[PDB]
mmCIF file of C-alpha atoms and ligand atoms in Angstrom:
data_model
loop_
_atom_site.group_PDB
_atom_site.id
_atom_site.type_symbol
_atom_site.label_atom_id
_atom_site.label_comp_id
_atom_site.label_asym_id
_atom_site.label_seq_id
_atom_site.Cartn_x
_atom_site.Cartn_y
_atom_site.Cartn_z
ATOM 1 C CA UNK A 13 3.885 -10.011 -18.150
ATOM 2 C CA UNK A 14 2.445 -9.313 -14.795
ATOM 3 C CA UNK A 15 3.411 -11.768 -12.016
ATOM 4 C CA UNK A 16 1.299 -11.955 -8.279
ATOM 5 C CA UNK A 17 1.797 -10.044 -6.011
ATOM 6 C CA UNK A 18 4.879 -10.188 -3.598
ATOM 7 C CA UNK A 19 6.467 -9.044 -0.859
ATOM 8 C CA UNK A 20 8.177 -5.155 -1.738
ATOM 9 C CA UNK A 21 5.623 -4.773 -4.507
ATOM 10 C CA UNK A 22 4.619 -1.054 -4.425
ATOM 11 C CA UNK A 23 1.001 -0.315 -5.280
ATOM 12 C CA UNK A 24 -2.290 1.846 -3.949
ATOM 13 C CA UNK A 25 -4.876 -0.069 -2.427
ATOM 14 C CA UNK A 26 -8.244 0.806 -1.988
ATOM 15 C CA UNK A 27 -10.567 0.363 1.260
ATOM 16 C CA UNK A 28 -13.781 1.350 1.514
ATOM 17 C CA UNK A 29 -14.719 5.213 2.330
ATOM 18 C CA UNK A 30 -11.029 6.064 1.439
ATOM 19 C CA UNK A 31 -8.708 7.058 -1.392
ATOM 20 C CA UNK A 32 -6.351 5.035 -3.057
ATOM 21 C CA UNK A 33 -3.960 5.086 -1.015
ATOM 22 C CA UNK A 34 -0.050 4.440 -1.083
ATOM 23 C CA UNK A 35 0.943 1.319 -0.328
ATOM 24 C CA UNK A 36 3.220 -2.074 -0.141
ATOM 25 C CA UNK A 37 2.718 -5.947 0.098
ATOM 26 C CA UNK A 38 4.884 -6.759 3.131
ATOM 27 C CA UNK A 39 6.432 -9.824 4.609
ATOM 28 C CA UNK A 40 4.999 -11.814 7.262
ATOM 29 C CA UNK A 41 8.044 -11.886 10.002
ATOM 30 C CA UNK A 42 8.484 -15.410 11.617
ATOM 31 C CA UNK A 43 5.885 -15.619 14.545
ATOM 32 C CA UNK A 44 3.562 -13.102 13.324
ATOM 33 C CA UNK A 45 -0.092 -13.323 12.823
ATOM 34 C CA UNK A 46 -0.834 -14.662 9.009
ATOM 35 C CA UNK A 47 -3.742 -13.098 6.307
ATOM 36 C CA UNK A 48 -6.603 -14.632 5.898
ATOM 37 C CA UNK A 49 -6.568 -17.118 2.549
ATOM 38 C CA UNK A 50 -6.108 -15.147 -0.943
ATOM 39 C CA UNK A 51 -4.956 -12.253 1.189
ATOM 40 C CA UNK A 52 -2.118 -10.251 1.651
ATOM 41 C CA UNK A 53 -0.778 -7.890 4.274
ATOM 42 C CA UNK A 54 -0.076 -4.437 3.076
ATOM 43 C CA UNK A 55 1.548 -1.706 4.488
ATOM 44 C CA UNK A 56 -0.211 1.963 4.540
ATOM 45 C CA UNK A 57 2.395 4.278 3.895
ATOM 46 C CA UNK A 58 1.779 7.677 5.930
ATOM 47 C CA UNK A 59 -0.447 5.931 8.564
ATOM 48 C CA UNK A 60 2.187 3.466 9.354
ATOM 49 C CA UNK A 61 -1.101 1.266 9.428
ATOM 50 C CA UNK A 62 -1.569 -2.843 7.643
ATOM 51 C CA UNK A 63 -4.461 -4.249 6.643
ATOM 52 C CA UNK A 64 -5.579 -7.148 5.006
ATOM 53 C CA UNK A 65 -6.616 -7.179 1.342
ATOM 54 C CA UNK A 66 -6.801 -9.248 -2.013
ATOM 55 C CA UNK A 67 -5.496 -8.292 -5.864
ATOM 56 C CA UNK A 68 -9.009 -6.350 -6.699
ATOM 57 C CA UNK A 69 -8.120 -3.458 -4.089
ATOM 58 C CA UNK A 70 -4.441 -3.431 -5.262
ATOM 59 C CA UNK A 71 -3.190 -1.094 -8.146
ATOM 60 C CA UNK A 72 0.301 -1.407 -9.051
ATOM 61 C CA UNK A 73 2.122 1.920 -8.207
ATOM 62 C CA UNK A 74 4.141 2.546 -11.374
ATOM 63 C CA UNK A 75 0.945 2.436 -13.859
ATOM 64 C CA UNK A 76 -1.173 4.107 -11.135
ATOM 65 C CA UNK A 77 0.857 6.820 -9.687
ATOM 66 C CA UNK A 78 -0.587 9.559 -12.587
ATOM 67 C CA UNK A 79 -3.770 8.724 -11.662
ATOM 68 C CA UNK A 80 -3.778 8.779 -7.878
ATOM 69 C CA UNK A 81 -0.547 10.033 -6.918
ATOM 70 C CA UNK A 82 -1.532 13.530 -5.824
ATOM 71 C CA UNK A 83 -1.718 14.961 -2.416
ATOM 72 C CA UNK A 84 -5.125 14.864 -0.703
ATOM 73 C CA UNK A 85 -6.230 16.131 2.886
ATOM 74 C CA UNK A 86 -6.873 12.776 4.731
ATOM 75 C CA UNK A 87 -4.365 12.337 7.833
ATOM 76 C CA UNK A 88 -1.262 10.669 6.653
ATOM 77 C CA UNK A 89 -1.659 10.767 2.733
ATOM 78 C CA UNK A 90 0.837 13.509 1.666
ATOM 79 C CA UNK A 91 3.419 11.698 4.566
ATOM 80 C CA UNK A 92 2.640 8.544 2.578
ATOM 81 C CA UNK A 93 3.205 9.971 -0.723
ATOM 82 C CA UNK A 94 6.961 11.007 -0.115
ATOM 83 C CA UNK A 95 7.596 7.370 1.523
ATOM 84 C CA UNK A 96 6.293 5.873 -1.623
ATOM 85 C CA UNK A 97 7.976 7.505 -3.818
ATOM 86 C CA UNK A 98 11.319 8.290 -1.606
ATOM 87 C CA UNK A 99 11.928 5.500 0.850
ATOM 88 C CA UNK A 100 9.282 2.900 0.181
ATOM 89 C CA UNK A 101 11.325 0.215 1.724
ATOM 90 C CA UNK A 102 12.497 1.388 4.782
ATOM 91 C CA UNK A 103 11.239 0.226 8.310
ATOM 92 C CA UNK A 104 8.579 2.132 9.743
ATOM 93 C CA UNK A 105 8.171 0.760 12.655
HETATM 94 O O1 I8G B 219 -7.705 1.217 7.203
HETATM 95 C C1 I8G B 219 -6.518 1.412 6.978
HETATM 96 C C2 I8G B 219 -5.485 0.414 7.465
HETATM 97 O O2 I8G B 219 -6.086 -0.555 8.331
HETATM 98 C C3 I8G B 219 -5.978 -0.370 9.692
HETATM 99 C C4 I8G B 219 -6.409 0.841 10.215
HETATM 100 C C5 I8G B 219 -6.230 1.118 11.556
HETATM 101 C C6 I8G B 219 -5.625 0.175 12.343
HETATM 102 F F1 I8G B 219 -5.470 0.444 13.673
HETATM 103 C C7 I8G B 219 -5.209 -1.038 11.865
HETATM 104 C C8 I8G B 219 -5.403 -1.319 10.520
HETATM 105 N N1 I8G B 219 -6.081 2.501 6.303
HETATM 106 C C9 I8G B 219 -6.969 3.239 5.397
HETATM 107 C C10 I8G B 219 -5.999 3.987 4.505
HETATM 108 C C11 I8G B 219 -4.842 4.333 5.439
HETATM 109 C C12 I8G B 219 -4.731 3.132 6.363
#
């Protein structure tokens, strides 16, 4: 059975006006700014980019990947596909 969401989870996550896009749930580091309540920090593969967002935007990448796992034109995607699926837990900063 499904547990929350953690730290290293792979997944896409949706914001508005974009595709679901590939993603992880990423650690805080000591002395870093904190989510808001209920929400976690996740990493936009491709874009390099984090944003804050809760479970209903996240789609876990293994039963998702068929679905949205398929190169599209917005800057960064296609990048963010190969991390996902090649070195999604490598820094990128
Ligand atoms: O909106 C985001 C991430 O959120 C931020 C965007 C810009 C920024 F300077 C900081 C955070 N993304 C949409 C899908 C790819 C990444």
């Amino acid at each position: 059975m499904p547990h929350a969401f953690k730290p290293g989870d792979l997944v896409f996550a949706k914001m508005k006006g974009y595709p679901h896009w590939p993603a992880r749930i990423d650690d805080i580091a000591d002395g870093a700014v904190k989510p808001p309540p209920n929400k976690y920090p996740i990493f936009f593969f491709g874009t390099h980019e984090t944003a804050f967002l809760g479970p209903k935007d996240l789609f876990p990448y293994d039963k998702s990947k068929d679905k949205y796992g398929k190169p599209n034109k917005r800057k960064g995607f296609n990048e963010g596909l190969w991390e996902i699926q090649n070195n999604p837990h490598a820094s990128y900063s």
